[PDB]
Design a protein around this nucleic acid. Structure first.
Lengths: 203, 106, 123, 158
RNA sequence: AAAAUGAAGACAUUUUAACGAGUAAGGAAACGAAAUGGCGUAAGGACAACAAAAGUAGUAAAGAUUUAAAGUAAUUUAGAU
RNA sequence: AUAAACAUACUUUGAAUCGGCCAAGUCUGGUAAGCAGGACUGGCGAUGCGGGAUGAACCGAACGUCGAGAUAAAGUGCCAAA
RNA sequence: GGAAAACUUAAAAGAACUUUGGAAAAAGAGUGAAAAGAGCUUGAAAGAGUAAUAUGUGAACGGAUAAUUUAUAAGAAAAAU
């Protein structure tokens, strides 16, 4: 039949050779560009093969200064590591820092010694399903235009799920106020004043 | 708002008496005075954040950068070597860079 | 699929002493003079075309599109690369008129052959 | 011989030119250089004053041996002359180009000299009998002068 | 250089190793595993839509001015005027 | 003892050349020469590069296009990398 | 003793009337497929003029590396069970 190198195409009422199959017996094929298979989705309780090895200075309930990204210089409390990605699930309790519950890579943080401890945080949710549910997606390529208001209406519809998952932060704020000067230390920023050299600072 | 970098001076490129190899740029990080205090900084990101005046009828930003890393010490005075994605312009010699605190290992 | 076409020198090897005089053209001619600043390879002026500059064999004579060049004069030349439309790209010669070009361009669509002169001699 | 530059709009332009005019090129190139841009009402007055030697024509480029003059203050030039035969030849084009505009129906109070260029023509050679039985050349330097007067209106750029 | 494969693929094949500066001077053409590889100008004999109208050209040749691509290089190809 | 198979032995034809110059834990004539003439060897000639600030010969070291590293001569107050 | 000098177009249809000017000429107008306009096929380089862009303390130009500006330039498919 058709050789492996032949892909017939239609002709718009133009001259064709004697050996070329006519248009009445030609069916068009869809151009295929994607070949690599995607990522297999597995159970929510099994860690991925591609899992970062946490530093020994990072333990749950610690206070991590963040030195890069949108929230630079803010201090957050590390709950647990997101298994499906390896990025830390930290929360700079929104009642204090203004830092929401997000994911961040382990190389952007500095682990201080002020361990908030706090067990019984009730992180039954906040798996990878929640984080993918609130991420603001794009408008794709063919979905009309929907310029601007698509992302504005995106955030509004995701507001409720974010607020509901703030039952994580109600308990943590309780023991932040317990230690004196720990609410002020957390609320403010992190700055490198004159005379503090990075190779000399110890946290 | 806050400071999360130490200003390193762009001294120049790794050279000889009558040569110049612009692939590697030397820095004199503020506060570092010996090669024994450099073991910390080997790896930390460095950016050459500069400013370009632009007309209102263009799209390009007015603040750009050239990011790089610190790769090895140099000399016994704490001078380091930095390799950038694009070699720093020789117009930046003597100016100040940024030495960030990530990828952190603390 | 396209291998990275790597170039060991992206400039032109201009003739020595062609930036001062106009009778000396910018086409390379190796200097044979005894005291020449360039044939001795003095520092600062030591640029000569040596076979080490030759580009990779796999990606030699390859256009940036990833396809080699194949010039066609008529519609019947297109059939010579109708089996290799993934390796060769037609390029209609510069003498072919503006009427025979629409025969080649349309036929190259039927056989699905990329043409580098699809906007040449248009009305 | 064709014009160096074509007018932006041919309904607002009047043209005049002279071919192989018998006047020095190094002199007219500097007289046509001063009057480029100024209104045709003022360019006619300036060329009337160079003749009677009350305005200077600064020799900006061909200034070798040209003496200093008192009217060359402010022009960034310390040299200047009063070419009378070169002014009289341009003055007979500005009168030709102005009277071409009246034929079309333009407004003479607005005309400006937008483009005026001087070229190099074909010289005519003579003999100058030198010492030791040698003969040299004695050749003129004629030039082609072009001219385009365009009505001046306030431009718009949104 | 040595092995392997070899009627036509192709990029003057595949694998391994050693090597590459140079004035005077030498290495003509052909030689399948090629006893160096090529570019350019002009002229002559052939080949150039293989189903009985068979290279390009008034739907714009040669030439000139530039712009891009290929080649390390001699140079080639293409777009526009 | 050690090295030697792209080892060894060559054959035919032929081009260029026979104005040379420098160094020295050497010599001769000369008061002496950046002089004249030699014996063994290395170079410049024919040769760039790093160093001696510059230098045909000195010291390191001989070159296809590159990237990363330890180096050689030699240096680390500034010009100038240390 | 002893040179230089070829070419408008298919055809002269080789501008034909007005305005400015002493005349040559210029601007309209017109012929012609196209001014190819008699210096007449296209028309390079040296040398110039006009426009646009950019630069600067006793030479200029070239090469390596970046920065700024301008130009060229890369796609229509699509996940897991």
């Amino acid at each position: 039949s058709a050789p492996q190198w032949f892909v017939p195409v239609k002709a718009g009422d133009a001259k064709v050779p004697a050996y070329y199959p006519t248009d009445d017996m030609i069916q068009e094929q869809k151009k295929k560009l994607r070949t690599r298979k995607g990522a297999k989705i597995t159970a929510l309780d099994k860690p991925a093969w591609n899992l970062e090895k946490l530093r020994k200075s990072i333990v749950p309930g610690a206070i991590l200064i963040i030195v890069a990204g949108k929230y630079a210089g803010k201090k957050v409390v590390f709950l647990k590591q997101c298994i499906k990605s390896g990025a830390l699930i930290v929360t700079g309790p929104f009642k204090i820092n203004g830092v929401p519950l997000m994911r961040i890579n382990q190389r952007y943080v500095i682990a201080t010694s002020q361990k908030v401890d706090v067990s019984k945080v009730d992180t039954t949710g906040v798996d990878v399903k929640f984080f993918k549910k609130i991420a603001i997606k794009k408008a794709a390529f063919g979905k009309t235009v929907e310029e601007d208001f698509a992302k504005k209406q995106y955030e509004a519809k995701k507001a409720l799920i974010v607020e509901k998952q703030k039952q994580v932060d109600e308990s943590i704020v309780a023991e932040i106020k317990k230690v004196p000067y720990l609410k002020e230390y957390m609320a403010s920023y992190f700055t490198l004043k004159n005379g503090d050299h990075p190779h000399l600072l110890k946290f | 708002k806050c400071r999360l970098h130490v200003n390193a001076v762009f001294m120049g490129f790794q050279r000889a008496q009558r040569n110049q190899y612009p692939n590697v740029a030397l820095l004199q990080i503020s506060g570092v005075n010996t090669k024994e205090d450099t073991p910390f900084y080997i790896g930390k990101r460095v950016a050459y954040v500069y400013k370009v005046n632009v007309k209102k009828g263009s799209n390009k930003p007015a603040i750009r950068a050239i990011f790089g890393k610190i790769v090895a010490p140099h000399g016994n005075h704490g001078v380091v070597k930095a390799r950038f994605l694009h070699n720093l312009p020789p117009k930046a010699m003597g100016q100040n860079l940024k030495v960030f605190l990530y990828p952190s290992n603390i | 699929i396209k291998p990275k076409i790597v170039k060991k020198y992206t400039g032109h090897f201009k003739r020595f002493d062609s930036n001062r005089f106009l009778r000396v053209k910018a086409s390379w001619r190796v200097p044979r003079g005894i005291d020449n600043r360039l044939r001795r390879k003095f520092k600062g002026t030591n640029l000569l075309p040596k076979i080490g500059y030759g580009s990779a064999k796999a990606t030699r004579n390859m256009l940036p599109c990833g396809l080699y060049k194949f010039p066609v004069r008529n519609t019947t030349d297109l059939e010579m690369i109708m089996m290799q439309n993934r390796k060769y790209a037609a390029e209609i010669s510069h003498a072919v008129s503006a009427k025979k070009r629409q025969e080649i361009i349309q036929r190259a669509k039927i056989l699905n052959i990329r043409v580098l002169n699809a906007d040449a001699r248009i009305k | 011989v064709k014009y160096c530059a074509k007018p932006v709009n041919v309904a607002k332009a009047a043209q005049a030119r002279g071919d192989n005019l018998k006047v020095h090129f190094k002199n007219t190139y500097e007289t046509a250089d001063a009057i480029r841009g100024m209104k045709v009402a003022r360019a006619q007055e300036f060329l009337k004053n160079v003749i009677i030697k009350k305005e200077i024509v600064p020799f900006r480029k061909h200034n070798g041996g040209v003496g200093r003059k008192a009217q060359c203050k402010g022009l960034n030039c310390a040299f200047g002359r009063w070419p009378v035969k070169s002014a009289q030849f341009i003055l007979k084009l500005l009168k030709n180009a102005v009277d071409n505009a009246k034929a079309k129906g333009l407004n003479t109070a607005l005309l400006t000299v937008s483009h005026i260029a001087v070229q190099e023509a074909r010289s005519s050679r003579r003999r100058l009998y030198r010492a030791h039985g040698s003969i040299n050349s004695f050749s003129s330097s004629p030039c082609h002068i072009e001219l385009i007067l365009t009505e001046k209106e306030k431009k718009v750029a949104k």
